[PDB]
Symmetry: C6
Subunit: 30 residues, 6 copies
């Protein structure tokens, strides 16, 4: 249960990290 819960939080953080790195990538093109 808790393991499942932590993993969706981990999953959600990685989605956010994924989004931010795409934006960083896009910006570094200039």
């Amino acid at each position: 249960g808790e393991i499942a819960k932590s993993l969706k939080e981990i999953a959600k953080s990685l989605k956010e990290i994924a989004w931010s790195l795409k934006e960083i990538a896009k910006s570094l093109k200039g």
Copy 2:
């Protein structure tokens, strides 16, 4: 037990990493 505790620490570090990257994205724009 320990696996759960490690996973909670992992989850928390990742929120911190997510936040810093938000700030970094904002600074580079």
Copy 3:
């Protein structure tokens, strides 16, 4: 079920993170 699902989403997010970092790496050379 849910753990596998989260792990499957974690895997997809890291593929995206990997690709974005390649793009950033490419940009810093170029």
Copy 4:
């Protein structure tokens, strides 16, 4: 057993990673 130890090492590396991104975030501001 081995699974827990890997997770505790994973936890510590993510803490190091979080701190470094804090540092990076500060410099880019």
Copy 5:
């Protein structure tokens, strides 16, 4: 099963992520 496949893709992505961050580290000196 599915968990194992997911952990290996993750393991593989992190190797790539590691390589890219190394290239980034290298470029940022000059």
Copy 6:
């Protein structure tokens, strides 16, 4: 067995990543 092995490779990769991010932080100062 395979789960344990994957987690150990995950742990080692996170160590490399931690090392890289340290180098990146220093150059950005």
